[PDB]
Amino acid sequence: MNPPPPETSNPNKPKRQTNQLQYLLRVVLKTLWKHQFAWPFQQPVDAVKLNLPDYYKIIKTPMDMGTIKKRLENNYYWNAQECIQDFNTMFTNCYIYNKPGDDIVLMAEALEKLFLQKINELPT
C-alpha cells in the first residue's frame, strides 16, 4: 500500500548550493522541525502503520519534511523555489487528503503560516 518514498538523490540532476538554500535548511526547516505540530510531517506517510490504505490512492505527489531535509543536506535542489515548492506540496497534500477543521489540517495550517513567515524575507 506504500509507494517508494520520493527520491533524495538523483545523479543525472544537477546540484547547486545557494545562500537561500542554506537558509532553508539552517533556519526554515530546522525551526519548523521543532514546532509542536511538526511530528506528523517529519517522515513519509506510512499507510500500513497509520492504517490509511487510501492515502496514496488520493495523494499522487507525496512530500514530507524528512524528504525535504534529506534533499537539502544532499544539495539535491537547484534553487530555493524548488525547495519551497516541496513545502507547498506537503501542505497542499494534507488539505487534499483531509477536510477543513481536522486536527491534522489545523496543524498544517499553523506550520504553513510559520513557513510563510520565515520565507517572507530570504538572504540575497
Ligand X SMILES: C[C@@H]1C(=O)N(C)c2ccc(N[C@H](C)c3ccccc3)cc2N1C1CC1
State in angstroms the smallest separation of the CB of 123 from ligand X.
Answer: 29
Q: Are 62 and 45 in contact (CB under 8 A)?
A: yes
Q: Which is nearer to ligand X, 83 or 94 (CB)?
A: 94
From the list 11, 76, 66, the residue with the least C-alpha distance to 41 is: 66
State in angstroms the smallest separation of the CB of 103 from ligand X.
Answer: 4
State in angstroms the smallest separation of the CB of 31 from ligand X.
Answer: 19
From the list 5, 123, 2, the residue with the least C-alpha distance to 71 is: 5
Q: Which is nearer to ligand X, 25 or 52 (CB)?
A: 52
Alpha helices for 24-64 (secondary structure H):
30-33, 55-58
The residues binding ligand X (CB under 6 A) are 40-41, 45, 50, 52, 55, 94, 97-98, 103-104
Q: Which is nearer to ligand X, 8 or 98 (CB)?
A: 98
The string of DSSP letters for 95-114 reads HHHS-TT-HHHHHHHHHHHH
**Which residue do the cell numbers 519551497 mark?**
84
Shortest-Cβ-distance residue relative to ligand X: 40
Q: Which is nearer to ligand X, 75 or 89 (CB)?
A: 89
State in angstroms the smallest separation of the CB of 14 from ligand X.
Answer: 30
Cα-only R_g, the chain: 14
